[PDB]
Structure formats: C-alpha cells, structure tokens
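User: Modeling request: complex.
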Amino acid sequence: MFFIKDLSLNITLHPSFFGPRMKQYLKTKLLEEVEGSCTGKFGYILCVLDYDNIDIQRGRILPTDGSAEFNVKYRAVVFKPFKGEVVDGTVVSCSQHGFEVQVGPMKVFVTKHLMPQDLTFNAGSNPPSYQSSEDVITIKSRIRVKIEGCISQVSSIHAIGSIKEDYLGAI
Amino acid sequence: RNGPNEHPGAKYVIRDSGDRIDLRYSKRAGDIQLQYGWKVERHIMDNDPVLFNRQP
Amino acid sequence: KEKAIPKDQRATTPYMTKYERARILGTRALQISMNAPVFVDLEGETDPLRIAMKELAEKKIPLVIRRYLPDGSFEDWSVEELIVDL
Amino acid sequence: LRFGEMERDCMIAHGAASFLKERLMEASDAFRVHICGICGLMTVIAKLN
Amino acid sequence: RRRRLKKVEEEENAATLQLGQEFQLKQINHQGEEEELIALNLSEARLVIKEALVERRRAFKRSETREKELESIDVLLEQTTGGNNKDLKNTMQYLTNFSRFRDQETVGAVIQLLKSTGLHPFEVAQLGSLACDTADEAKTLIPSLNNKISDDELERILKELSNLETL
Amino acid sequence: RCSFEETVEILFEAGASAELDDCRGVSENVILGQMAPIGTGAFDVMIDEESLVKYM
Amino acid sequence: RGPNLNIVLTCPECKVYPPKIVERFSEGDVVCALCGLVLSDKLVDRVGEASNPLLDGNNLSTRIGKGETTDMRFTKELNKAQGKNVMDKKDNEVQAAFAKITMLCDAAELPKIVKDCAKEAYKLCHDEKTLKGKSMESIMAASI
Amino acid sequence: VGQQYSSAPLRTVKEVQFGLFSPEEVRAISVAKIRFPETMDETQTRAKIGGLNDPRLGSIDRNLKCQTCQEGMNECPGHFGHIDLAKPVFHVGFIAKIKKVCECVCMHCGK
Amino acid sequence: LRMKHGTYDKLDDDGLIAPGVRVSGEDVIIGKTTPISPDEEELGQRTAYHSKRDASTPLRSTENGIVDQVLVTTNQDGLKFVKVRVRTTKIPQIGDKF
Ligand SMILES: [Zn+2]
Ligand SMILES: [Zn+2]
Ligand SMILES: [Zn+2]
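Assistant: Request completed. Predicted assembly structure:
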C-alpha cells in the first residue's frame, strides 16, 4: 500500500560542509540517505514530496564528533506492506521452495504450502516453472498474491504471500 | 617516515575507515601515503598542552 | 516552542563566559582540523587553535550558544554578538 | 595510572567537562551497548552483520 | 508522558483494518493540524511520484502508450534522482505496468467516485488498485468490505470503475 | 547518593521505591560516561546558517 | 556435532592464509606482521578460586563457616542440611578416598607428586566392574 | 579496530528508572534455562549446554563467539539465563522492608 | 605455540643462558614448554605441527644486565628447578635519592 507520510530524520553533516551552501547539502543527503531506503516502521521510503520546502531546523554540534546534527521534517511517499492485503506483482525468481513475486520495491515469497495442491514444481522445463491444468506460473508471470505474514526489521521488510484463496494466482 | 624509534616521530596511522597501522612492521611496503581526514598518532612534541598532577 | 526565549527579553549576560570561549575555540578548532572552510584570512598559520583564535578575534565563527536555564528554557546567543572581554 | 575521585573533583572545579569525559571514556573502558525503548535493559540481541 | 512497559498490541492485519500505530486513520502533520491517513491507489501513487520528479527536475535545471511512457519515466528517473535508487526504479516500472488510470482526469474521476461510500482510506485505495468484476470478488479480496457496503452499491461502483479504464 | 556511602542499601531502596533518576548531577553523568552539564557543558553549541551565508 | 563458534584472526588486506600474527602484549594489540594492520585491540591479560580438573572433574562446592558475627545455631543446622544432599553423596566417596590416600601418603613422608599420581590412579581405576569385590585398602595400597 | 558499525540511532541516557524484576520478566529476558550445576562437560573440552558457562549466555574468550548474537568478546554484552527456584525465597536486601509491609497489612486478606 | 616476541637465541639445549652472557629487555632467560590438549584452536595458527606451548620466563622489560649465575637443583619433591641471577651496575643520575 502507498501512503503519503510525514517523516522526520536526523542528518549529520561533516564539518567539511559548513559553508554558505550547507542547506543544499542537507537536501542532497536527504535524497541520498532516505529515498530508496527501507524502514520497518514506515516501509520503503520511495519519493520525497515538496523537495523545495523541507523544514531544516537549527543544527547542534556534537561534542566530540564535531559534526552538526539536523532534525529534518519532510513529506514522502512510502510503501508499507500489511498482512491480509492483496497485491499484484511479477514473478522474478522460481525454485523448489516456491516463487518470488515483485510488488513495487518489495519481494513477496510464496511457499509451497501456501500454494494450491494442483500446482507442482517442474525443474525440467527451462526456465523452471509451476505447472497445473489451468495455468503455468513462471518468471515474468503476473500473480495476484495475498500477503500472509510480514516481518519488519529496522532496515528490512520480508513478507510471505499465498495464492490458495479464490480469485488469486495467475491474472 | 621517521618511524616510532626517533623523536620527533610517529607510532600509528589511522585511516578514515578506522583501521590502525602500526608503523613497526609497516616499513616493508615503504612509507604510507597520507590522505586528508586521516590520523597520525605521533609523539608528544614541545608546547603540547598536558595535565600535570600531584596526589593527594 | 515555549522554552525558546524571544531575543527581545533575554536576561542573560551579554558577555561570553570562560567556559563558552573554551568550548567555542575547541569546537571550531576541531572543525578546522577536519577541513572546515575558514572564514578568516590566514597570514601564515597551521595550528587549528590559532586559526580559531583569529576567527574569534574577527568575529567569524558561525556558531550560537544555547544557554540553558534551571527550568529547561534557553536563550540563543550568537558568537558574533557576544562580547569577548575576559 | 589512577585518575581517582580527587582528580575528578579538581577537574570539575576547572569546568573541563569534555576532558573529564575523555579521561573516563576514551582513556579507559568505553563500551557500546544496545538498549530497548520499551524496557531500558541491555537485553537487545544485535546481529550487526 | 507516564511509564511504559510491555502492553498487548493489536497485531497488524489489513483484513481487520488494524494498520498499526504509525498508520492510524487520524494523523498529525508537521504543523500540528489533524489530517486523515492518505492512502493512494496504484494510479494515484504513480501520478503523485512522477509529479514530484518533474518539479525536482525543474529545480535543478532552473538553478501515450505503455512502452514510450515507461522509457520516458526511466530516463527522467535516472536524471532526477540520486544514487542507490534501485527501489524507485522498480517502483516506477511496477506502477506503469499495473495502473488502470492513465491521466489526471481519469484518476480525479475515481477519487470523486469512491469518496461517496465513506469507507476507510485503505479500502478505497484497494478498490482503485485491484480490478474486480463482481461484488463477491471485492468482498473476498478485501475482507474488510464485508458488512460495510451492500452488494447493490458495490456492483455499480465496480462497473463505473471499469468504465473509465483506458486501453 | 550511592557514590558517597551505603551504596547497595541506597540502590535497593531505589528499586523498591522505583526512583527516577533524571541524571542532572555530575555523578550520574560520570557513571554514564557522558558530558556533565557543568562548566563547558552548561550550554549547547548550535550552527548558525544566518551567519554562514553572510561570511562569504 | 555442535556450532562452530570459532574466531580466526587473518589480515583482510594481505589475504595470506595462514597469516603472520604478532601479539604486542605491551601495546595490547594483535597486528599483521607483514603490513602492520591491527586486527584486534583492547586484548585482556581474590575474586575466584582455583581447582584441578584432573582429580575433581567439574564440581564447584562452597563451605559454611563462622564469620565475625555468627550464632552457632544457624551454622550447625545449615551444615546439617547441607550434608543431606543426594547428588553430592556420590563424589564424596571419591573425596573421602582422597583424604585417606593423603593421610597415608603424608604418614609415609612421600612427595606431593606421589600422592597426586595415587589420587589420579584411584579416580581413573574407580567406578569399574572389575574392582568391585576388592577391599578399599587393596585399592589404596595399589594406587600408592 | 574498534566496535562494528550499527544501524541503531546513537542517543544519550536521559533518565534511569530503578525497579524490581518480575518473575515473568526474568523468564522473558532469559536466553537459556540453567539446570546443571557444572561448567564443562565430561570431556572438559567445551562448555556444557544448560550449565553455568552455557555458550548461549556469551563468551569471555578471544577465540569463541556467542551462540546468541554471533559476536566476539569485545562486542557481546552478555546474555542472562534464569534458574526457576523450587520454592520462593526472600531477597536478603528486602527482609526488613518485607517485615515492615507485613506489619502494615493483614496477614490473612492483604488489606 | 604462544612463544614470546623476545629472542630465544641465547638459550642452550637445556633452556638456560650460560653465565657471562649479556641480556636485555624481553630476552628469555629460562626456556620452558608444556604439552597441550588437542581440539583447541586460537586465532587459527594451531596446526598438527604444534604440540607444545611456551611457558618461558623473560627478563624484566625495563631491566638489563649480564647473567651472573645459573644453578640447577631439585626441590623437596624431586622436581627440577633453576635459579638465574643477573648483574647490572647502577650509576647515580638525576632521579636517585641520597
Ligand atoms: Zn525491551
Ligand atoms: Zn597484513
Ligand atoms: Zn552474545
């Protein structure tokens, strides 16, 4: 799911950037340290909105580091997965332990036990694929997956999905 | 270049990554090339401020 | 921000304290040692502490001192506006 | 050499807060631990790799 | 702020619309003003993201079928974003290949369409992201819709959502 | 208080009474190895952008 | 049959394996002898008690005795309770045998090495099916 | 060398909240249940699992890792085990405090 | 294993420096080894070749001089033990008390 979130970050500036154009460096650091990053609390931080109007507060010199610590408030578009949510994606990898679906910046892992019984793994075909009477699931195929679990770490999110329920699977 | 056995000299070189180089056992590859932001742990020289104390 | 006293009613001394000068010189000296842009002209000087002293004398240290009060409130004083008389 | 309590008192009387910290931290045992925001205990298992 | 120790927290679950602690319905922005949780469907998210990229490109410089749009987004992405953008490239590529509403007019119609139901922001965003043909499909793909909207309204809403589908 | 005398008795009473220590004294900061709010620590040093832009 | 949990010190830069490693104990450093890179710092060099894990194995025990202030009642009962432990009973037999071996070896004016070997011989040869119908005196005399 | 980089934010201790451990907390915090009064197994080559020096509580040797965090001696803070006592026992440092509470409340209804 | 960084060049086959030899800091004056138990690897560096570990006695770090006397005898228990004496001359300097 895509949300527009109000986020805060603590950025550190090396003393080498204590010049008349330090605010630009803070903006560059924000786009280089936040955009594309993953946080278990807010999901994948994708894009920073209103790049011209970030609120840069007064910086605090750290006692022994000598660097300035800036609190930065910004508005960003973040993708956060939730268990029980249904998403669409493209299969990127297939193996004996199931296939992986790519949904935006996230990869959902579908285990065999979360697949319908008829589906079976066929390593003989190149590329390997899951074959059943009605459909074939392979790399680049489009699958509707229901996220069954999400484990969020401070800098990583991994989810497991299922295609057993009705109206799921190959699109 | 002087090394750790001649005052004024130096004992360690610390790179920006946090790696510390003992100047003993380091001359095998020759003198190290210094870079900005590095640290040279060198002998305390003249006019260095130091705290001088007598107990009690 | 109720703990930031507006500049028009600051009741603290307009003079830099000895501890404020010591930390400002040490703070700016450390920054100079880390290749910070020097805003004062150097007529020949390599010690970061001496460069900081030159900056303080010419009022070119871009720092402010957040003086804290025993109730949690604070006052912001620029190094340029603080009198260095001690 | 021992930087004892009396020495600490003298440095407090000098107002050298940063020097007092460096003596007690970087000239002696300095250790980094991970604490939990819910419980203030040092019971966080950190797989830093 | 008083003491805090382990309290039993409602496990996150989309089916129950229990989105957690930071994704509550009522949010507080940087100005302290109360706001509703902004949930975006795939088409809305695609427009919002690429609307900021063009503005970002404008900032630096001053101081359509699927394939061509995909390439245009790709070239714009590399120009207007910094390093370690491996996630944003996949996101923009994923949004172009899974969006149902192309232009702003189409998206604007959807927003003015689904806001009459009074559903949760998560539910409306889901109804604009997944193509459902029957009310039963939306009732099982979005378990939260159960006992919130009658099949009579859902059937017509899905029909109108499928109506404004380009290509 | 535990730094002076009766260290363990004071700490047990702190536990039973669930005392909150706000770490505003020198001893608490010495124990935690952080800059005490004394002398050079009685204030914070911030960076001034308004002056940075005009110093060039 | 268990987790590895082994740390091997090698120079990331030199990459030569096995590496030349020098332990600068005075400096508290472990340094690569070829490049000088330091691999581990802050190496370490009554609060405990010693025991010999060759005659006693793994058995940590503590005595109960009087202090600067003590009532004989508590000491007598605590010793009474401590004696009635079922697990420590097994090893006390070996310790009692050690005590008598020490007494015999001391009344014989024998060196400490002799009694240490005698006690070790007893422990190794004890608790076996062959020596179960023989008197303890024969066991002790043979061990000595 | 120094300690390895961490992704957690670096903060300064602002408050210390003293208190008492609950039995539930001691069990939850514990990484292992200590049930053997030994330190090494019968071979005296490795530490006994479930004993005092369980490899799960940390390591104090420069050559071994912690089985819990997989970090060396200079990074592992140590991990707590727990022993479930057969019967409740007093805390020697609170007996006087415990006595005073007993004289304050009824010893049959706790009021 | 665990041999000290000093020099063993002055020891003889019996692990003792002959009297009359000059010694300095970190020099080993009594060489001794003890056997080790297998299945214990430290910092790697422990191969099948290694079967002994160093238990030597080095000269005091700050002291130097010439070995004056070495006597080898047996204790009350019959174990071999040795005494090594080292000579040095102290000449008055700017820190000596009189
Ligand atoms: Zn916790
Ligand atoms: Zn090397
Ligand atoms: Zn550990």
